[PDB]
Ligand binder design. Structure first.
Ligand SMILES: N[C@@H](CCC(=O)N[C@@H](CSc1ccc([N+](=O)[O-])c2nonc12)C(=O)NCC(=O)O)C(=O)O
Ligand SMILES: N[C@@H](CCC(=O)N[C@@H](CSc1ccc([N+](=O)[O-])c2nonc12)C(=O)NCC(=O)O)C(=O)O
Lengths: 215, 215
């Protein structure tokens, strides 16, 4: 049976989930939620996610929220020998996937996301202006974060090691929107980060979700 | 052999790791890192954590950072039948542990932590004053977050279900410092959240780490 993803397909946190689904070949459906109509706060959505945020996820009777929890459920349930993006079979490998999934959430996203938010999601979505001081500050922070990624990705093809993993998939959605800002060329200053990004953009599952991240 | 935790024992993110270690009965050592001397940026610390933050962790040749990644490595490595705080044996249970570990990081900590930071870690640690507007705003947010916890914890003894888990352990460290602020009595307005907190405070492993979270 279809598992179901609740939110607009464009949403970065929906795309984390839908990318994990494509990468394991799961049958799924995307049920839109209309921010313009406050559906994410409707009682039917609070049933799914009592904090009233997208995405939510339904597998039969199971209702999940927080894109990363959802994601790990998809990767565990549909795990084949050919697709172990969590490396739970290997304690040290599962540890490196964990470290870099935490780095995405606590170090990299907090430096990148406000540039996406200020340069893109504020003018284009909301209509509110671009805070050039939030941008200059996040950009300086992101330069320093990409110095450590550059080091990591000149030793290993992927963040976890020499295998694509959940760690890498975590970075795709917000970075894809970063690449539609005026600051996209920043990655060109980090040739190994760039090469890693192009390898990710070349994966069939990423090209398919990239396709869904338009209005 | 000792595994090693790098940071001051007081640190909330050190305590997440040290609590997971006590809860599985692992032999470990805490190697101090002196913020007053910038040791967290020393070259010896950047070897452990290239972003120059505590905690770091060493198991033999393995070097880990991000307290939650560390934590899951400890819980997987020292997993007994009697201590499965990740519930990886059960896909739905492992999913609920994930959801509420994400909620701690993305919903609960961002509303609680600035009250700890403003009321406690700024005057007592740093010497900078308390932003009463950050406090009033985080408190209103935290009230709404605790309404959803109150609902959850009137159906299940713990956030994951009727079993203590990593989800619950995640909430201990910052909440322990919240309980040393003037706003500690806030939990008394959420009788099930409170009862859950007292059950956590009664666990031998939590009393032992509580003991380490003083100057
Ligand atoms: N840690 C969570 C984060 C979930 C999250 O931040 N979701 C946002 C998604 S924000 C969003 C807001 C607004 C619009 N819009 O169309 O104007 C969006 N379109 O797509 N996503 C949109 C949300 O639902 N916020 C609403 C709220 O907190 O009240 C996760 O990874 O799932
Ligand atoms: N997501 C990470 C978060 C790690 C973290 O925020 N660590 C802080 C810990 S902050 C801290 C800062 C200052 C003092 N002090 O003694 O004045 C501390 N004592 O204990 N912890 C202290 C840090 O090292 N920051 C330094 C930096 O970013 O430059 C995780 O869970 O491990």
């Amino acid at each position: 049976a279809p598992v179901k993803v609740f939110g607009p397909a464009m949403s970065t946190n929906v795309a984390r989930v839908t990318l994990c689904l494509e990468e394991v070949g799961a049958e799924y459906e995307v049920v839109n939620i209309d921010f313009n109509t406050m559906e994410h706060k409707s009682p039917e959505h609070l049933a799914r996610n009592p904090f009233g945020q997208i995405p939510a996820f339904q597998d039969g009777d199971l209702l999940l929220w927080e894109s990363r929890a959802i994601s790990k459920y998809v990767l565990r349930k549909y795990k084949t020998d050919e697709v172990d993006l969590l490396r739970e079979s290997n304690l040290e490998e599962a540890a490196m996937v964990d470290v870099w999934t935490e780095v995405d959430a606590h170090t990299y996203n907090p430096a990148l996301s406000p540039i996406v938010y200020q340069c893109l999601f504020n003018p284009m979505m909301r209509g509110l202006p671009t805070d050039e001081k939030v941008v200059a500050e996040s950009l300086e922070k992101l330069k320093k974060v990409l110095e450590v990624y550059e080091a990591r990705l000149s030793k290993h093809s992927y963040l976890a090691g020499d295998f694509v993993s959940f760690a890498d998939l975590n970075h795709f959605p917000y970075t894809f929107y970063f690449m539609a800002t005026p600051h996209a060329a920043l990655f060109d200053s980090y040739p190994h980060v760039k090469a890693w990004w192009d390898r990710l953009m070349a994966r069939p599952a990423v090209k398919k979700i990239a396709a869904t991240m338009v209005p």
